[PDB]
Amino acid sequence: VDKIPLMSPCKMGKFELCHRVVLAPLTRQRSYGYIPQPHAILHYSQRSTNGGLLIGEATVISETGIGYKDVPGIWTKEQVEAWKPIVDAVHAKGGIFFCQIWHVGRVSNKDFQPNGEDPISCTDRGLTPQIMSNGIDIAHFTRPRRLTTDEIPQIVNEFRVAARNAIEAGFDGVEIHGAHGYLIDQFMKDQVNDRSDKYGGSLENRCRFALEIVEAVANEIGSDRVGIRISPFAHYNEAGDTNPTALGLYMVESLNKYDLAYCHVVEPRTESLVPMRKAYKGTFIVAGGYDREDGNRALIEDRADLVAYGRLFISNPDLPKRFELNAPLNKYNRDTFYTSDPIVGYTDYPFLE
Numbered sequence: 589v590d591k592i593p594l595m596s597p598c599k600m601g602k603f604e605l606c607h608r609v610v611l612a613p614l615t616r617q618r619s620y621g622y623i624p625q626p627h628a629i630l631h632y633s634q635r636s637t638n639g640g641l642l643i644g645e646a647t648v649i650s651e652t653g654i655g656y657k658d659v660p661g662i663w664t665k666e667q668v669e670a671w672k673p674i675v676d677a678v679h680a681k682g683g684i685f686f687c688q689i690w691h692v693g694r695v696s697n698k699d700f701q702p703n704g705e706d707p708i709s710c711t712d713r714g715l716t717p718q719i720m721s722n723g724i725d726i727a728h729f730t731r732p733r734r735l736t737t738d739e740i741p742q743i744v745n746e747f748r749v750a751a752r753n754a755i756e757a758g759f760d761g762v763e764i765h766g767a768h769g770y771l772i773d774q775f776m777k778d779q780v781n782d783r784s785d786k787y788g789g790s791l792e793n794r795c796r797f798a799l800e801i802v803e804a805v806a807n808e809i810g811s812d813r814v815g816i817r818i819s820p821f822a823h824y825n826e827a828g829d830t831n832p833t834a835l836g837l838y839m840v841e842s843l844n845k846y847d848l849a850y851c852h853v854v855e856p857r858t859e860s861l862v863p864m865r866k867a868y869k870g871t872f873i874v875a876g877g878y879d880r881e882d883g884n885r886a887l888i889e890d891r892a893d894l895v896a897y898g899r900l901f902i903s904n905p906d907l908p909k910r911f912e913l914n915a916p917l918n919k920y921n922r923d924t925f926y927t928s929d930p931i932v933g934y935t936d937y938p939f940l941e
């Protein structure tokens with residue numbers, strides 16, 4: 589077997605990764621009652637390799653951050669203890685595990701909120717209905733409540749606690765969810781942020797929330813245990829920006845001072861991550877539409893240090909091994925991406941024979 593770029597070792601902060609194939613954060617909606625479950629142990633265990641990086645599924649930081657059924661949270665002792673066995677199985681195979689901490693902001697409904705309250709956001713504009721994963725049901729969203737200037741720090745604090753909880757759970761680090769139109773991205777994107785205070789207006793102001801969050805977390809658990817994900821070019825959840833590249837450049841530049849473990853950036857649908865990679869001084873992770881070929885290339889062309897795989901890692905437990913041996917890949921069934929069975933479409937994808 590000839591060595592390939594995707595299999596090359598890599599130093600990422602305090603971690604010695606053995607290869608560059610990363611498991612991207614994947615929401616599977618199989619965490620009943622917002623509590624991590626036993627089947628997650630097998631799932632993440634099936635995907636752990638020695639020195640391989642795994643980014644866990646988006647994990648809700650607080651009650652108000654829920655916008656989906658059965659997603660895991662990390663604000664209660666019950667949730668923390670539930671994560672431990674999952675974290676242990678991953679470590680048992682020598683993998684590095686980061687918990688993605690998340691808050692949906694306006695992407696929610698009052699039925700998901702405590703005491704039927706409205707979701708919180710940088711704006712009071714809500715989302716139009718969207719078709720769910722099955723293609724039969726419609727997702728309706730409640731208009732959000734625009735957070736006041738002095739409430740925001742309270743939210744910044746929620747990410748902090750959560751980050752702390754993740755470490756108590758055993759996680760090696762946390763990835764801040766600054767993408768896909770959720771709370772943090774809502775503040776960054778100008779098509780959404782219509783604030784008149786310091787958290788809105790200019791590009792510097794719109795990124796303040798994010799940067800305050802990065803600082804709160806880095807300070808709490810050490811910047812070497814912190815990663816952040818952004819999607820400057822995505823319009824997911826009606827959250828675009830009239831100047832993606834500047835937003836992206838402003839962000840990476842701004843993050844250099846925090847000496848993070850990495851910056852995870854999502855590819856577009858021109859628009860390029862290259863300028864961002866060039867402006868960012870630390871470990872750069874790219875994700876979105878990659879295969880084995882595109883992965884080795886991006887690494888060889890200096891476009892990234894690590895490559896995250898979503899859909900392919902869903903249907904291929906041994907993705908790294910298959911890339912290392914250039915073996916065929918299992919097809920993935922999107923119909924069971926978000927379904928709720930503990931096995932079907934979650935842990936029944938076969939390893940190489």
Ligand SMILES: Cc1cc2nc3c(=O)[nH]c(=O)nc-3n(C[C@H](O)[C@H](O)[C@H](O)COP(=O)(O)O)c2cc1C
Pocket residue numbers: 612613614615616645646688765767768817854875876877878896897898899900925926
């Ligand atoms: C079923 C599913 C769940 C996802 N859950 C998350 C999530 O919780 N957090 C996140 O940042 N991205 C999430 N994503 C986006 C992926 O992390 C990744 O960026 C996307 O799959 C692009 O890569 P791919 O072409 O290799 O699948 C999800 C994608 C899918 C298909």
